[PDB]
Symmetry: D2
Subunit: 431 residues, 4 copies
């Protein structure tokens, strides 16, 4: 088989460790957070990633998945170790490499024999050199002579579809600088990729850049379509028709062209900013990406502007309802969510904000406390509301009872940030 | 069906010819007597593979005829297509004079119901101006004749237009009446993926499509330029991101920029449309800026290589057209490179298998026109590969090195693996 | 919309639950009162990925309710789906029973949509059955009938339903088209890929799609079996042909045959429909012959390897369900293997992550049920890998070698490449 | 690279010409001096003009002597025909192999692009080696398989923009050399036998789809379903795909009929019966009788002396090729029962005359064909037939009956019969 260690319990580490176990590997998944580690082991933590809770539980029961807090205990047990720790934005916008290098030093401190270290974390081009050096310095301090290889294997799964994205990926990208790493990685993924061995091998630097360019291009599709939607509004065109009209060109493709109230999540904002910053360090300005960022920042302001413009600037103190708080459907994650930008402005003007999300309300309460009203379901939310904002397109919002909404609301006004509705109400949307 | 098509650029000529191929009776019209004259004698006014032969058989069969008079075509036609150019106007706006000219001729000549379909790339809302122009001529003549207007944008590439027309990824049609919808359906159904929408949305679709493709290129050019500074391989990065089905693997090639008669003008026109409406298209303006800078990269590589010492050097250029498979040199990256080489007093030898006459019209005696690729490099201290014509793909490196004064190749299209080779990313 | 769905099989349960997840009010009906109680309470095990949790949340939210009386749900429904069983002649009694019940309860216009796989022309009998009940009641009420076959596969049912390649709908009225459009438009955010056709063509499409899938498989099994004899690699062949965009890369995997109720049922249904009309489906008859023979291949390789002397040998089987992700063993290749093993007197140890309770219902004490994949192989002289559950993918071969009496693996799904073992596979 | 290509059918001529267009120095060889004289001075879009520019530019040359081309080439392609006991005729391929062996002066890579049965590469090596042996010379060489996937009449596009390139090799030297050839122009490397099998399996799968759809169409007719709607309904499943699902009056051409048969024969020689393919073949043979039978049934068996018209003779649009054409089965049966047959094809009429002589009347255009016709058969879906003037047809015909073997027409007076 393989013995695999994974460092990190973010989506990436948790999903990857769990899926490798599901595939028959013996896996140890490690993190510094002892509380969460014990809860993952016990099955006492709410998990909203579809299928993940049961997949963890079955692989723990089967004895193929174990959770721990000590990298130094896992290293001598593993044939391959994946660094899948966070790379959040640093104070100046560059990728914060502190957690990645902490893991690398721990690996070097505990190494007992040859091991392959694979960096799955999103790390700037050249990072593999810093990781290698950190590991080697620890071996030197120890005065030991132990062989190892490093590789890059960025992850491309999205929150909300993580297991399917991991188990049936469009491709797997792998940066290597050795035959040994290529062989070991081939043998790891060959049994998984039954349709076609679609592992793309390349040099390490190129694999690291690939992750940045991918997320940057996705963000660019979205900001591009946002600018087009906003223009459509002024000239009397229908952006959903335009989307169909251009996505049908096979050179463009039909996915990730949805305009709306912006992209959120931790990843696109942090990764676009880090790539911009890597470029600046090298004397280069990334003008397309700078524009994509500016557009997205403005787009997160539009829902409030629609609401205030409908009411001709008279919105102080009104009651409103919001459907959707998470940054996208299928998660409790609210990092960089457009909902928070809307909420913050609504609070500045003293609105009474009633919120509902099928999963993210505990996270919302962690962020907002008593500043908003938490409601039991979508219909409870709209009681007495003078506007309804549809911000995150969870499936339960898709087919509302408009009659019931109209009876419950103070004013029959819906502002759709995700362009899902057609009325049988005044409906405002993007484009 | 009896169809008229106005215009004999690739859009009008290819659509007219293909409609005839499919069994329609087609009259294709233009104001240029000389070009029509050549078409009547079996010579095409454009460089389009397979076209002259397709015309020949369809003229012989009696399904295709050419003319210079809209007013004689109109009374015979069930549907007339406006497919004339909409080049950049003086202020970057789409020049609508040719389109409205055609619209007015149609209104002068109309005798009964006709559907007018605009295939020309026209700004959103142009259908309203076109209807008004037609109505005004009907009003002058004091006649009472209904008509419909539709948008059917073109997605053809010069040089591969027949294949693009005959096997399209989709057909986009903007209509505002059932009668127009039924009539266009009956035209396309014996060919075929048909997207019906309102007229404004069809007009916008054409600009948005062209703008997204330009966007892909400028995006990849910024990535390529960064790759160079950080030691990543942009060919591997292209493979790595294009393999995601959300992005796709086509139209991701970095190089020395985009040119032609379509992207620069359509991107400009869309940015201007925005400005007229008090909106700034931020992504597109940045896409435009990146592309303008990218057309300077080849010369800058050359100059940096010779450490700024370039005066009086002989150089050779492979490729002059803005892309392979055409004589078209509008906004070509080659012209930006040549302009700069000339400014610093380089001796410039050029070869293109198709575009040399067009180059000669543009440059006169300023560059040396050579007979073949190997003839171009004789005595050269730099070879620039600017346009990726197929014949340039497998060069004899011995034959080159022993003919050139210096074995330097600066590849603006990332086709070559080995001389010193400079490339993009 | 207020929607009713009759039937609590894969198709009925998944459609009902997904419609409620999308915000509709849904009543889901079946005669089985015990199972209906367990569905409302969230107390029946469900191995369809995601389904148990989605049912529970929609029940709790009040969008999904299970019941036993169709006649209760009809006056409250805008659309009613018939998704009951139609178990090579089709038993239509369940569909027509539902149709009659609808006719007895109808108070106003309703659209009746048949999602069950039914013979071509069934819509005419369904309309006639409903009308008889209206006539008997002396009521004059208009209604429409439609066909909306289901294309989901077991093990991926929710994703298949929520993000389908297409939705096929047979209709004969604008009112029905408009109503069906209003149901699906909100779901299909990427593009509206509802294909409207006449009702008979929608019925035929369901059988023809499944029959084409079966045809690809039997085609590749004949190619794999030839590959063994001429020294070609069928995995390289699959890549070689699947890369032609006119062919495509999906459902080309040769193996120990196709199972499940659906492919055999639907291939046979077309064969029989042809015979009923003086025709013969020659390609499909061959596809079925090839599949029958393919289900003997694993045993034949085992016997040949031991030169026909196999009585009294212990063997182990990994995988019992007809495919991974279900407990469903209907027409499973595992059962054909097990039968032949028992017919020659081999001792059979079995393991499947999910299907062992079903296997015990089917086999009783005929085979030994084991606790995990490694327990299964203890003392075995051959290991058959029949159903490619993921936990089987990366085995500890040394452990297998130590536990087994002989290191022989016979792989009916072409997943393994050896790192001491002998590996036999298909092509 | 210096490349030689042996064979001047569309496979060899297109491959040779496309290699030259891409900058290679190419010598293209055939045994027929007049065809080579013509070329230095087939029906295929764009190929005439591509040959001309590459001959002028001195990258493409035609010759009759393999012997002269071999010591000049880095890579030689065998691209001669393997026409149909039913097994593949290997005589042309082996002739080329022996000539290469007779001429070799140094290491060369021999690439077989001809469609050849699994294991043929062994015979090819043996043939070349025996010649080297006869000469008592010690020269190493490699052999590879590189099957072609070109469709007649869309061949340049198929070559230049292929879905994939398939290469069977048994040496790293061959792999590097072939990689160096294609990279400047998605390449699947495998062992040689798997490459040879891939070609047969691909064509057999395409045939299978057709016969599958023809059985479904014929059934649709009997149960009141519309096979065009069924085609859209099943091809929209991404597992199936929407291309190459068109029922009609059968597949023809040289390729599918002979390759299906050859594969069936390879299997028999190996003690295996390909039951799916044998059924596919049977269905297609019967399908080519469907048009005539629809005509005879329509007229209640009383057909002697009636005049009929046929639109389309070639096995498919875009070619003059009539090998195994459904039109020939239709015409032969029409002549048997004493019908008078008028034909029109925009390209294939000279080929038809070679096969039919004076047995049919050749006409000038689609309208001339239907004059006094009591049935019009649409057999090959050439584009000029797509928007007929149905009034004009009505007036010219003796009876307004159209029998469509390609399901292209919907009527706007006429009776239309079609397949499914
Ligand atoms: O680096 C990462 O970990 C991941 O980041 C993203 O995944 P994620 O941010 O979880 O989710 P997405 O589905 O990309 O959504 C991002 C945001 O874009 C928005 N969005 C998405 C698509 C669209 O067309 N329009 C649009 O506004 C979403 O609603 C959401 O707010 C990428 O999609 C993953 O490939 C990548 O692996
Ligand atoms: O390349 C990959 O990543 C995927 O390849 C296949 O996925 P796919 O070809 O999309 O097929 P599925 O939709 O997962 O399964 C469809 C049918 O094919 C069958 N199948 C799949 C794989 C295989 O090797 N043999 C085989 O018969 C399954 O049993 C099932 O009935 C595998 O089934 C997945 O485990 C894997 O994630
Ligand atoms: O509006 C039009 O009539 C046409 O404009 C373009 O066609 P065209 O400009 O002829 O040619 P492209 O192949 O799109 O090339 C445009 C430019 O981009 C460059 N390019 C193209 C692709 C690429 O990946 N990278 C890149 O630098 C080309 O070399 C060329 O300079 C579009 O591709 C057509 O879909 C459209 O119909
Ligand atoms: O009519 C139905 O209810 C369903 O029947 C099948 O779904 P199902 O039988 O549940 O599952 P499949 O994944 O199609 O598996 C069928 C069998 O084929 C086998 N298989 C599948 C794919 C393959 O390439 N090779 C192969 O042997 C599988 O292992 C399994 O035994 C169809 O795939 C669905 O589209 C259809 O809706
Ligand atoms: O047409 C359909 O059946 C599918 O269309 C979309 O699916 P898809 O375009 O494949 O996108 P997903 O993978 O579901 O989502 C990708 C990203 O796009 C975003 N998205 C999706 C839909 C939308 O309207 N707007 C939008 O921004 C999501 O928030 C997510 O971040 C819907 O999101 C699916 O729920 C639906 O089943
Ligand atoms: O071996 C070869 O050289 C070629 O054989 C065929 O090409 P070809 O026979 O020239 O033409 P096809 O377009 O495949 O048509 C074959 C026959 O099938 C019929 N056909 C095709 C497609 C269809 O859906 N239905 C159908 O009846 C056509 O009318 C024609 O009679 C294959 O398509 C090529 O990929 C292959 O390279």
């Amino acid at each position: 088989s393989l013995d695999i260690a994974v460092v990190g319990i973010g989506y990436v580490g948790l999903v990857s460790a769990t899926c490798f176990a599901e595939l028959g590997a013996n896996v140890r998944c490690i993190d510094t957070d002892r509380n969460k580690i014990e809860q993952l082991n016990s099955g006492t933590i709410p998990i909203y990633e579809p299928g993940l809770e049961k997949m963890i539980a079955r692989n723990v029961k089967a004895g193929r998945l174990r959770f721990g807090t000590e990298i130094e205990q896992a290293v001598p047990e593993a044939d391959i170790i994946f660094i899948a720790v966070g790379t959040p934005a640093g104070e100046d916008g560059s990728a914060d490499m502190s957690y990645v290098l902490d893991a690398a030093r721990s690996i070097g401190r505990a190494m007992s024999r040859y091991i392959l270290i694979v960096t799955k974390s999103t790390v700037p081009v050249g990072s593999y050199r810093l990781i290698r050096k950190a590991i080697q310095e620890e071996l030197d301090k120890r005065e030991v002579l132990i062989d190892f290889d490093i590789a890059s294997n960025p992850e491309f799964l999205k929150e909300g579809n993580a297991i399917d994205d991991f188990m049936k990926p469009d491709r797997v990208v792998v940066g290597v600088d050795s035959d040994r790493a290529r062989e070991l990685i081939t043998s790891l993924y060959k049994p998984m990729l039954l349709n076609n061995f679609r592992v793309l091998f390349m040099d390490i630097a190129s694999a690291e850049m690939t992750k940045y360019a991918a997320n940057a291009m996705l963000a660019t599709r979205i900001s591009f379509m946002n600018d087009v939607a906003n223009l459509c509004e002024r000239v009397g065109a229908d952006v959903s028709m335009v989307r169909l009209g251009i996505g049908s060109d096979s050179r463009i493709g039909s996915k990730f062209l949805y305009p709306g109230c912006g992209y959120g999540g931790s990843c696109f904002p942090k990764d676009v900013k880090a790539l911009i910053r890597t470029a600046e360090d090298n004397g280069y300005r990334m003008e397309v990406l700078e524009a994509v960022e500016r557009v997205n920042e403005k787009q997160k302001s539009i829902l409030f502007d629609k609401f205030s413009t409908y009411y001709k600037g008279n919105v102080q103190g009104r009651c409103v309802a919001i459907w959707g708080l998470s940054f996208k459907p299928g998660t409790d994650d609210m990092r960089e969510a457009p909902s928070l930008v809307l909420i913050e402005k609504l609070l500045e003007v003293g609105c009474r904000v009633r919120v509902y999300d099928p999963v993210a309300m505990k996270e919302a309460q962690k962020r907002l406390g008593d500043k908003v009203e938490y409601t039991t379901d979508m219909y409870d939310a709209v009681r007495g509301a003078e506007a309804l904002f549809h911000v995150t397109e969870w499936k339960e919002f898709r087919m509302p009872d408009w009659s019931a909404l109209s009876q419950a609301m103070a004013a029959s006004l819906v502002i759709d940030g995700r362009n899902v509705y057609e009325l049988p109400f005044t409906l405002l949307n993007i484009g």
